[PDB]
Design a protein around this ligand. Structure first.
Ligand SMILES: COc1ccc(CC[C@H]2OC(=O)[C@@H]3CCCCN3C(=O)[C@@H](C3CCCCC3)c3cc(OC)c(OC)c(c3)OC/C=C/COc3cccc2c3)cc1OC
Length: 128
């Protein structure tokens, strides 16, 4: 990913406009529609710590990742970010700890005050 390019060119998609979630579109999607709260969302993704010491990918489990949009099942940055996505889009998100795991993190994976970077491909979404 290009966290300088996201820092430099990224859209602030936070309510508070505190630059806590910055988005680039890397590939434009084919849908006009973005998902609604409660929609079952299907993605592929890869994520990392900004320090480059831990990694994760949906492919590590050989299946798309599924969550409920806007239900707090995943970090706030995801609920915020995926809500802005069309089917087929690939976006990069640079995420400050206030929109991820904050001061206590989630050890061992997530240190205190960790900045995260994700690539998300929105595959599909379906109501309730
Ligand atoms: C205290 O608050 C929480 C603590 C822990 C969780 C569980 C992790 C949750 O993961 C996420 O929300 C984000 C976004 C969706 C993909 C995974 N993810 C991560 O933060 C990755 C992380 C990316 C950066 C490099 C290190 C790994 C992550 C974090 C974990 O714990 C903090 C994981 O252990 C559970 C982890 C994957 O394991 C693989 C799981 C992947 C997807 O399944 C999830 C299902 C529900 C919630 C999350 C993940 C959720 C929390 O609140 C929402």
């Amino acid at each position: 990913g290009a966290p300088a390019t996201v820092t430099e060119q990224g859209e602030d998609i936070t309510s508070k406009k505190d630059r806590g979630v910055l988005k680039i579109v890397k590939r434009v999607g084919n849908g006009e529609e973005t998902p609604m709260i409660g929609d079952k969302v299907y993605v592929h993704y890869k994520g990392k710590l900004s320090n480059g010491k831990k990694f994760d990918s949906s492919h590590d489990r050989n299946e798309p990742f599924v969550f409920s949009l806007g239900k707090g099942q995943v970090i706030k940055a995801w609920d915020i970010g995926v809500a802005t996505m069309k089917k087929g889009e690939i976006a990069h998100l640079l995420i400050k700890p206030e929109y991820a795991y904050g001061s206590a993190g989630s050890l061992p994976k997530i240190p205190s005050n960790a900045t995260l970077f994700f690539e998300i491909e929105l595959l599909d979404f379906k109501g309730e």
